[PDB]
Amino acid sequence: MIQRTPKIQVYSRHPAENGKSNFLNCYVSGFHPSDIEVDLLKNGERIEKVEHSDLSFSPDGSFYLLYYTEFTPTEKDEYACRVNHVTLSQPKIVKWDRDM
């Protein structure tokens, strides 16, 4: 058996074809086993509607999860990714840096 804790990155993107649509993204990568719980938070509260994911495996069986959805950030709001995984004894929270 192998267990590997995920690397978590939180960032924002506009599709190059549409600068009017902003997306908040969590990329949760390199993890084993694949069981996981991933949420986006807005001011500490779970965002229930997250419209997209891309889920994949590498040759060594590591998992790669992209979890993302449209949003409209304002300067008062703090966003974050919260992850639970077998490797984490408490939920891991990674805050979004609004420059990213």
UniProtKB/Swiss-Prot annotation:
GO terms for biological process: amyloid fibril formation; antigen processing and presentation of endogenous peptide antigen via MHC class I; antigen processing and presentation of exogenous peptide antigen via MHC class II; antigen processing and presentation of exogenous protein antigen via MHC class Ib, TAP-dependent; cellular response to iron ion; cellular response to iron(III) ion; cellular response to nicotine; intracellular iron ion homeostasis. The modification Pyrrolidone carboxylic acid is found at Q3. Glycation of Ile-2 is observed in long-term hemodialysis patients. GO terms for cellular component: cytosol; early endosome lumen; early endosome membrane; endoplasmic reticulum; endoplasmic reticulum lumen; ER to Golgi transport vesicle membrane; external side of plasma membrane; extracellular exosome. It is found in: Secreted; Cell surface. Glycans are attached at I2, K20, K42, K49, P59, K92, K95. Disulfide bonds join C26-C81. Keywords: Amyloid, Amyloidosis, Disease variant, Disulfide bond, Glycation, Glycoprotein, Immunity, Immunoglobulin domain, MHC I, Pyrrolidone carboxylic acid, Secreted, Signal. Residues 6-94 form the Ig-like C1-type domain. It comes from the Eukaryota. GO terms for molecular function: identical protein binding; MHC class II protein complex binding; peptide antigen binding; protein homodimerization activity; structural molecule activity. It is linked to Immunodeficiency 43: A disorder characterized by marked reduction in serum concentrations of immunoglobulins and albumin, and hypoproteinemia due to hypercatabolism. Patients may suffer from recurrent respiratory tract infections and severe skin disease. Amyloidosis, hereditary systemic 6: A form of hereditary systemic amyloidosis, a disorder characterized by amyloid deposition in multiple tissues resulting in a wide clinical spectrum. AMYLD6 is mainly characterized by gastrointestinal and cardiac symptoms. Neurologic involvement, sicca syndrome, and carpal tunnel syndrome may also be present. Inheritance is autosomal dominant. Component of the class I major histocompatibility complex (MHC). Involved in the presentation of peptide antigens to the immune system. Exogenously applied M.tuberculosis EsxA or EsxA-EsxB (or EsxA expressed in host) binds B2M and decreases its export to the cell surface (total protein levels do not change), probably leading to defects in class I antigen presentation. Belongs to the beta-2-microglobulin family. Heterodimer of an alpha chain and a beta chain. Beta-2-microglobulin is the beta-chain of major histocompatibility complex class I molecules. Polymers of beta 2-microglobulin can be found in tissues from patients on long-term hemodialysis. B2M alone (not in complex with HLA-I) interacts with M.tuberculosis EsxA (ESAT-6) and an EsxA-EsxB (CFP-10) complex; the tripartite complex can be detected in the host endoplasmic reticulum. The B2M-EsxA complex can be detected in patients with pleural tuberculosis and is stable from pH 4.0 to 8.0 and in the presence of 2M NaCl. This is Beta-2-microglobulin. It comes from Homo sapiens. The lineage of its organism: Eukaryota, Metazoa, Chordata, Craniata, Vertebrata. The chain holds residues 21 to 119 of 119 of the full protein.
